């Protein structure tokens, strides 16, 4: 089930078995990388870039047209953001909850959610430090986090 | 020993319900555990409908009804013979008596 | 449930050692109490000096008078209530005599209808109470 909530729902993607590009997809590897670079410059996370290519350009999997994933394409060119997208959205939510918690003082539900989000931030950042994605001195400060989002 | 699978009430997936008060004793009983009895009866009983019909100023006037929602606690519902005890296997029948 | 991990020998050893103290038979033999309160101090028998001759009544539904003796031990001066087992052997007992008392069946537990007696007399005047009952060592 989920990590911080009950529920055993299985709503995910089911990739096909055929690891090959279809015959009706004429976009080569260079054409796909040009589309990613244009979309990554205008501020689109790797999750959002793959959505546009899938639903408008017929690119079912960028991993198949190219040899690398979307993040590795941006990391090679140098367009990857400083902090990962998943860790960025967890901090974005914690700032929104904390900003709501300082106005509404007696909403114990929002105070309970702030502990859940900050618990996911520390465990996700701990994984990134082991993979050397973040500096060892990195630390989530509840006061200085609003300037990172 | 556990006497009823539903614990004598109807609460599945909840923690607290609004307690209502009984009618003839005014005891705080949960809304789902209370023994409800919707009685719909005419304002004029059958012993006086003829006398009211003769004294009616209209030609065809249907007498109204008195809708009373009664909530009985387990203590008063059994004492008032609204509900009775049943056999160990005859307790599972949830169909109301015809 | 139990932790079946291959590196859980510390968790199992610490859990079993702690739960053994919730055993009534184990906590009695591995503590200062139940041995300091024991008048014999962990011995089998004990000698003492007869102080009085008291008779405790048997508990219900029995009805009799148990011929007991108020004895004061030598090594610690504690006062216990021994029991003169056989028939008429209280006459062989005289006040201010040296008697060898011992346990009474169950360990530190009152045996039978006797209310609180957990000891019994074995010898008296450095002669056995059993020989006095069988007409030997007339004393």
């Amino acid at each position: 089930g989920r990590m911080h909530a009950p529920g055993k729902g299985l709503s995910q993607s089911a990739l096909p078995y055929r690891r090959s590009v279809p015959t009706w997809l004429k976009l080569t590897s260079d054409d796909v990388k040009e589309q990613i670079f244009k979309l990554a410059k205008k501020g689109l996370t790797p999750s959002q870039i793959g959505v546009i290519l899938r639903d408008s350009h017929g690119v079912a999997q960028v991993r198949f047209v190219t040899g690398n994933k979307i993040l590795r394409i941006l990391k090679s060119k140098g367009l990857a953001p400083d902090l990962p997208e998943d860790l960025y959205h967890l901090i974005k939510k914690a700032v929104a909850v904390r900003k709501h918690l300082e106005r509404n003082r007696k909403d114990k539900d929002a105070k309970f959610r702030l502990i859940l989000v900050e618990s996911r931030i520390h465990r996700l950042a701990r994984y990134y430090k082991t993979r050397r994605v973040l500096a060892p001195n990195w630390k989530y400060e509840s006061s200085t986090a609003s300037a990172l989002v | 020993t556990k006497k009823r699978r539903n614990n004598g009430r109807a609460k599945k997936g909840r923690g607290h319900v609004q307690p209502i008060r009984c009618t003839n004793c005014a005891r705080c009983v949960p809304k789902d555990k209370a023994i409800k009895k919707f009685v719909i009866r005419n304002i004029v009983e059958a012993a006086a409908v003829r006398d009211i019909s003769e004294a009616s100023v209209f030609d065809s006037y249907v007498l109204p009804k008195l809708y009373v929602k009664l909530h009985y606690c387990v203590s008063c519902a059994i004492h008032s013979k609204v509900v009775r005890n049943r056999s160990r296997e005859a307790r599972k029948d949830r169909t109301p008596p015809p | 449930g139990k932790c079946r991990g291959l590196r859980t020998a510390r968790k199992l050893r610490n859990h079993r050692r702690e739960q053994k103290w919730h055993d009534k038979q184990y906590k009695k033999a591995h503590l200062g109490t139940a041995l300091k309160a024991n008048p014999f101090g962990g011995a089998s028998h004990a000698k003492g000096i007869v102080l009085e001759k008291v008779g405790v009544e048997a508990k219900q539904p029995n009805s009799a008078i148990r011929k007991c003796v108020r004895v004061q031990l030598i090594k610690n001066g504690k006062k216990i209530t021994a029991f003169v087992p056989n028939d008429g052997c209280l006459n062989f007992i005289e006040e201010n005599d040296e008697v060898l008392v011992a346990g009474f069946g169950r360990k530190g537990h009152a045996v039978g209808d006797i209310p609180g007696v957990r000891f019994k007399v074995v010898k008296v005047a450095n002669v056995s109470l059993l020989a006095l009952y069988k007409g030997k060592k007339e004393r």
Binding site: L15, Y17, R19 | - | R4, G5, L6
Partner: protein, 129 residues
């Protein structure tokens, strides 16, 4: 979460066997399971099985011959020497005439009788009889 996928494989086989089924589908495929099902098949406890190969962990569909009583694992996977092997046979196997204890030695995953002939010990996966 799903730990010790070999346990979930033998538990599915043991259950489907008592229900009287003829084929059982194992959700996670593993080389440890295939090496375990091969030893069970070489002694005539299960039939043939198709390793359904998707581009993931993979699934297995095993045929059942009705000859298996119970197949299980030893969860801690203790280290069994060649001297302590006799002790495990008495506790797990229901008889000295049949039943096998699948071990994991340096010579490969095999039963306890083959470990005696090759004169080597290792870790214990489970049993079947």
């Amino acid at each position: 979460v799903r730990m010790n996928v070999l346990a979930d494989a033998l538990k599915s086989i043991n259950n489907a066997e008592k229900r009287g089924k003829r084929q059982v589908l194992l959700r996670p495929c593993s080389k440890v399971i295939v090496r375990f099902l091969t030893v069970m098949m070489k002694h005539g406890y299960i039939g043939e099985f198709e390793i359904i190969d998707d581009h993931r962990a993979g699934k297995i569909v095993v045929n059942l011959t009705g000859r298996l009583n119970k197949c299980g694992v030893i969860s801690p996977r203790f280290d069994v020497q060649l001297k302590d092997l006799e002790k495990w046979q008495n506790n797990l196997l229901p008889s000295r005439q049949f039943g096998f204890i699948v071990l994991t030695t340096s010579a490969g995953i095999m039963d306890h009788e083959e470990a005696r002939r090759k004169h080597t010990g290792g870790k214990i996966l489970g049993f079947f009889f």
